[PDB]
């Protein structure tokens, strides 16, 4: 049986994309740029801060100095950190708390494999910290998803090989990173987005220990 589960944060445990979106929107409004809506935000998801800011500036064809660019970037991050102060256990995705309990009761290791720079803070606010055996530090890994490094680090941090692990992800890059790490992916979302070759569930309420066991046995 698998010995660990490696969790992405956004789109698996909770929604942080909402707060990034709101923070970019509020920045854009604050400097008179229109058009930062949820559709446009698709071009900002999982993209660096610089790239995002550049794309938002490119809407209005607005020019800034290096000093101004830096300050804008900081203001968005400050706004994001303010907005996540509201995170609570009410923000945990369905099925996830029960899954963590059940994994823990079965001595299966639980690790976070997220690019979130606020991962520990977020898990604390959601009261999940006690379930986690490690949180992979994205500052200590060389390359981001779809590189496998973050999943490798998460596995190793709990004393397992990625080949002994299931990885849970909602993104194409993340599924690819899981695959390349050696772990078994189980996607959440749509096969139209994540591929027909992996097991995918429609939402997180389908991530149960029994289902994960069945998937493991069938691989
Ligand atoms: Mg995700």
From Swiss-Prot:
Gene Ontology cellular-component terms listed: cytoplasm
Its family remark reads: Belongs to the HAD-like hydrolase superfamily. CbbY/CbbZ/Gph/YieH family.
Q: Impact of changing residue 46 to V on the protein?
A: 10'000-fold decrease in catalytic efficiency
Q: Which residues carry this modification: 4-aspartylphosphate?
A: 8
Task: Please classify the protein's predominant subcellular localization into one broad category.
Answer: cytoplasm
The name of this protein is Beta-phosphoglucomutase
- What is expression of this protein induced or repressed by? By maltose, trehalose and sucrose and repressed by glucose and lactose.
């Amino acid at each position: 049986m698998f010995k660990a589960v490696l969790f992405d944060l956004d789109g698996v445990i909770t929604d942080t994309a909402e707060y990034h979106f709101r923070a970019w929107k509020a920045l854009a409004e604050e400097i008179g740029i229109n058009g930062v809506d949820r559709q446009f935000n698709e071009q900002l998801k999982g993209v660096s801060r610089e790239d995002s800011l550049q794309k938002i500036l490119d809407l209005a064809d607005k020019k800034v100095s290096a000093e101004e660019f830096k300050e804008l970037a900081k203001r968005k991050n400050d706004n994001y950190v303010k907005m996540i102060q509201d995170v609570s256990p009410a923000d945990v995705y369905p099925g996830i708390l029960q899954l963590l309990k059940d994994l823990r009761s079965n001595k299966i290791k639980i690790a976070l494999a997220s690019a979130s720079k606020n991962g520990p803070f977020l898990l604390e606010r959601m009261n999940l910290t006690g379930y986690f055996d490690a949180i992979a530090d994205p500052a200590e890994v060389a390359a981001s998803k779809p590189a496998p490094d973050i999943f490798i680090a998460a596995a190793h941090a709990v004393g397992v090989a990625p080949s002994e692990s299931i990885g849970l992800e909602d993104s194409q890059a993340g599924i690819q990173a899981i695959k390349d790490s050696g772990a078994l992916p189980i996607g959440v979302g749509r096969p139209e987005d994540l591929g027909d070759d992996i097991v995918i569930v429609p939402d997180t309420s389908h991530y149960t220990l029994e289902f994960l066991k069945e998937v493991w046995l069938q691989k």
